[PDB]
Design a protein around this ligand. Structure first.
Ligand SMILES: CC(C)(COP(=O)(O)OP(=O)(O)OC[C@H]1O[C@@H](n2cnc3c(N)ncnc32)[C@H](O)[C@@H]1OP(=O)(O)O)[C@@H](O)C(=O)NCCC(=O)NCCS
Ligand SMILES: CCCOP(=O)(O)OC[C@H]1O[C@@H](n2cnc3c(N)ncnc32)[C@H](O)[C@@H]1O
Ligand SMILES: [Mg+2]
Length: 634
C-alpha cells in the first residue's frame, strides 16, 4: 500500500513531486550551485565564496562548507526575527504538570539569551571554551545553548539520564570549564536529581577543568552547596545586561559536541560546526515538516539528544517557527497526555518516536480518549525502525488519516535528515523512510564494499558529503576517520543496514555493528560490557539486545562471576544498579544470565552471534552452546 499525498497538503506544500526530483538532481550533480543558493536561508554576516570543499579519502577526511562565510547562529535563530516577529511565540513550554506552562516570545527569548551571554562572558567564558549542559526540559536549557552559541562557546549538552560517572567521563574528555544544571528535573510527577549528580561527578579526581557550576532552581529541593564554585541562575542573569551584540563566527567554528555510543569504546564527542549545520537543519526542518509561518511545531525529543538540538531548537528557531518544549512524558498522568497537549496548544506538526507511539498504542483508544486532534496537519517519526502496524496506528489514531507521516532516518553524525519523505512530494509506505534528502547520496554495499543495484540490501553508506555532516570527533580526528571511513574506502559508513525496494525506497533494518536500540536510545554493547566487568565480582560479560514489543530492544547480559562468587537476589540487584551507576538507567540490563561458559573462538574473541540467537529464544568449545541453551531455559 502506497499512501497518496492529501489535497490539503498538495495545495500549500513548499515542494511538490516534480520539484523534489529536480532539486534533488541538481543538489547531486551541482551541489555548489544548489547549496550556494540554499545557504541563503540563513543570514550571513559576510557572504561565502566556496561552497563544497570535502574529501572522504582514507586517513585523510576533510569536510568544509561555506568555509569563508561568517555568521552567528543566535542571530539567525533570534535577532533576525525581532523586527517582524518579536511578539510571535518562539517557545511554548508545557510543564510536567499541565497547570504549568509558558509562552516565550522571540523578543523575550532574545532578551534572556543576551543576558545569559553576558553572564557567561562576565564569568570568564570565551569563544572556543566548552560548556557542559546537564539540564532538564525547561526554557533555561535553550537559553543556555543559544547563549553559548551566540558567543562562539562550544556547548556540550549531556542528557539528564546519564549517571554521575557518565557525566564525569564527558567533562574529562571535553575539559569543560563550566557546568550548567538545575537542582532537579521534573518528569512524570517525580523529581530527578541533577545538581547532586554534578557534585558526585566533580568528586572524580580526573575532573580538573570545572571551575563553576550555575544552578537553576527548578524544584527548590535541599541540595549541597559549594560557595564560590556554585552560583544560582537567577542571581547571575538578573545582574547581566540585556544588551549584547552578536560577533561574527566562522562557518567552520565548532558549534557543539554530542557524546554518542559506538560499536566499541566509550561514547565519543561527535562535533558539529556552525555553517553547514545550521543551513542543513533549517532546510530539512522547513521542507520535511512543510513549515508555514504560523504553524505550531512540536518535537518531543529530549534536548539532550541530537534530535533535540536539530529539531526542537535550532532548525525551527532559525526558520522563525513556534516550537514546543514538553517537560514530562507522553503518557503521564495518562496515555492521552500527548494528544491533550496537542489540543491545548493547537499543534499542527507532531514529531515523536516509535517507542512512545508503541507505548501509547499499547493503551488502545485510551491515548486519544477525550481529545480532538484536528489541529494536526503533519506527523513525524524518528530514532528507530517503525513497523507498518505502529505506523498505521499512528497515522489513523493520531493523524486521523489526514496527516502524512515523515519517517526521518539520520544520525548524530549527519546533523540532519538524510533519508526522509517530503509531505507534498513523496507518497508514503508504512515503515519506510523513503527517498534521500537533497545533497544525500545513499548506497548499499556488501561486506566487501561492492555496491548493490536494484531491489537489494546491504550496508548503508553515503557516497558523498552534505552540509550538516559531523566534522570530527572532539580531540580525535583519527578515530573519526577510522570509525566512519575505513570500512568502505571513500565512503561514509553509518553502521546501519537497509534494503531498497522495486521503487527505490529505503527501509532501514537497524544497526549492523554492535550498537543497541533501547527505547529509541543508541547504546554500545561494548560500553555496557566494560561497565559490568568493572565490577569487583565480575570477570567477564557479553551483552546482546533482544526484541521488545515496546522499547524495540531489551538488554540481555551474560555475566561470568569471579571464582568464589555466587548468584543471589542481592548480587542480581547490585549488578543491575552497578550499570545504572556506571552509565545510567537507560543501559540497565533487563536480564542477567549467569554463566561460566561464554562462547568463544580459538583466538580468544567472543562470538556474540550465537549469544544473540539463544537470548532471543532460538567454536573453541562447542559444548557451551548446550549448557547456555539450558541455563536460558531456566
Ligand atoms: C514510556 C515512555 C514515556 C518513556 O520511555 P523510556 O524513554 O524508556 O523511559 P522510562 O520512563 O521507561 O525510563 C527508564 C529509566 O530512565 C530514566 N530516565 C528516562 N528519561 C530520563 C531523563 N530525561 N532524566 C533522567 N532520568 C531519565 C528513568 O528515571 C528510568 O529509571 P529508573 O527506573 O531507575 O527510575 C515512552 O513512551 C517515550 O515517550 N519515550 C521517548 C524516549 C525516546 O525514544 N527519545 C528520543 C526521541 S528522538
Ligand atoms: C536520529 C535520532 C537519533 O540519533 P542517534 O545517533 O542517537 O542514532 C542514530 C541511529 O538510530 C537509528 N535510527 C534513527 N532514525 C531512524 C529511523 N527513522 N528509522 C530507523 N532507524 C533509525 C539508526 O540505527 C541510526 O544509526
Ligand atoms: Mg572486575
Amino acid at each position: 500500500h502506497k499512501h497518496a499525498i492529501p489535497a490539503n497538503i498538495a495545495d500549500r506544500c513548499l515542494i511538490n513531486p516534480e520539484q523534489y526530483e529536480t532539486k534533488y538532481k541538481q543538489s547531486i550533480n551541482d551541489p555548489d550551485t544548489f547549496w550556494g543558493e540554499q545557504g541563503k536561508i540563513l543570514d550571513w554576516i559576510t557572504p561565502y565564496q566556496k561552497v563544497k570543499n570535502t574529501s572522504f579519502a582514507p586517513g585523510n577526511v576533510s569536510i568544509k562548507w561555506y568555509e569563508d562565510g561568517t555568521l552567528n547562529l543566535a542571530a539567525n535563530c533570534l535577532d533576525r526575527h525581532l523586527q517582524e516577529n518579536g511578539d510571535r511565540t518562539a517557545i511554548i513550554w508545557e510543564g510536567d504538570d499541565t497547570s504549568q506552562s509558558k509562552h516565550i516570545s522571540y523578543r523575550e527569548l532574545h532578551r534572556d539569551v543576551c543576558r545569559f551571554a553576558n553572564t557567561l562572558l562576565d564569568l570568564g567564558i570565551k569563544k572556543g571554551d566548552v560548556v557542559a549542559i546537564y539540564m532538564p526540559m525547561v526554557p533555561e536549557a535553550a537559553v543556555a545553548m543559544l547563549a553559548c552559541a551566540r558567543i562562539g562557546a562550544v556547548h556540550s549538552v549531556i542528557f539528564g539520564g546519564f549517571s554521575p560517572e557518565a557525566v564525569a567521563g564527558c567533562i574529562i574528555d571535553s575539559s569543560s570549564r563550566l557546568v550548567i544544571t538545575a537542582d532537579e528535573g521534573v518528569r512524570a510527577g517525580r523529581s530527578i536529581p541533577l545538581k547532586k549528580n554534578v557534585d558526585d561527578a566533580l568528586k572524580n579526581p580526573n575532573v580538573t577543568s570545572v571551575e563553576h557550576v550555575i544552578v537553576l532552581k527548578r524544584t527548590g529541593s535541599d541540595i549541597d552547596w559549594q560557595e564560590g564554585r556554585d552560583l544560582w541562575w537567577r542571581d547571575l542573569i538578573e545582574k547581566a545586561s540585556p544588551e549584547h551584540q552578536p560577533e561574527a563566527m566562522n562557518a567552520e567554528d565548532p558549534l557543539f559536541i554530542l557524546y554518542t555510543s559506538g560499536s566499541t569504546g566509550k561514547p565519543k564527542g561527535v562535533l558539529h560546526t556552525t555553517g553547514g549545520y545550521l543551513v542543513y537543519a533549517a532546510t530539512t526542518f522547513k521542507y520535511v515538516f512543510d513549515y508555514h509561518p504560523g504553524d505550531i511545531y512540536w518535537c518531543t525529543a529530549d534536548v539532550g539528544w541530537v534530535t533535540g538540538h536539530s529539531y526542537l531548537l535550532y532548525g525551527p528557531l532559525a526558520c522563525g517557527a513556534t516550537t514546543l518544549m514538553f517537560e514530562g512524558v507522553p503518557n503521564w498522568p495518562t496515555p492521552a497526555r500527548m494528544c491533550q497537549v496537542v489540543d491545548k496548544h493547537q499543534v499542527n506538526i507532531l514529531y515523536t518516536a516509535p517507542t512512545a507511539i508503541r507505548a501509547l498504542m499499547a493503551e488502545g483508544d485510551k491515548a486519544i480518549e477525550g481529545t480532538d486532534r484536528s489541529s494536526l496537519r503533519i506527523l513525524g517519526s524518528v530514532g528507530e525502525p517503525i513497523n507498518p502496524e505502529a505506523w498505521e496506528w499512528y497515522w489513523k489514531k493520531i493523524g486521523k488519516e489526514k496527516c502524512p507521516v515523515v519517517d526521518t532516518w539520520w544520525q548524530t553524525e549527519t546533523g540532519g535528515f538524510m533519508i526522509t519523505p517530503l509531505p507534498g512530494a513523496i507518497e508514503l509506505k508504512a515503515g519506510s523512510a523513503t527517498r534521500p534528502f537533497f545533497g544525500v547520496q545513499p548506497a548499499l554495499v556488501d561486506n566487501e564494499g561492492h555496491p548493490q543495484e536494484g531491489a537489494t540490501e546491504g550496508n548503508l553508506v553515503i557516497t558523498d558529503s552534505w552540509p550538516g555532516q559531523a566534522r570530527t570527533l572532539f580531540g580525535d580526528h583519527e578515530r573519526f576517520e577510522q570509525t566512519y571511513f575505513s570500512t568502505f574506502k571513500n565512503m561514509y559508513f553509518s553502521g546501519d543496514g537497509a534494503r531498497r525496494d522495486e521503487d527505490g525506497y529505503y527501509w532501514i533494518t537497524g544497526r549492523v555493528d554492535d550498537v543497541l536500540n533501547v527505547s529509541g536510545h543508541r547504546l554500545g554493547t561494548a560500553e555496557i560490557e566494560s561497565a559490568l566487568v568493572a565490577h569487583p565480582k565480575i570477570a567477564e560479560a557479553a551483552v546482546v539486545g533482544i526484541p521488545h514489543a515496546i522499547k524495540g530492544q531489551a538488554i540481555y547480559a551474560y555475566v561470568t562471576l569471579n571464582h568464589g562468587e555466587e548468584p543471589s537476589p542481592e548480587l542480581y540487584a547490585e549488578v543491575r544498579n552497578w550499570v545504572r551507576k556506571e552509565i545510567g538507567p537507560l543501559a540497565t540490563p533487563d536480564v542477567l544470565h549467569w554463566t561460566d561458559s561464554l562462547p568463544k573462538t580459538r583466538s580468544g574473541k567472543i562470538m556474540r552471534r550465537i549469544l544473540r540467537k539463544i537470548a532471543a529464544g532460538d567454536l573453541a568449545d562447542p559444548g557451551v552452546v548446550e549448557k547456555l541453551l539450558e541455563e536460558k531455559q531456566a
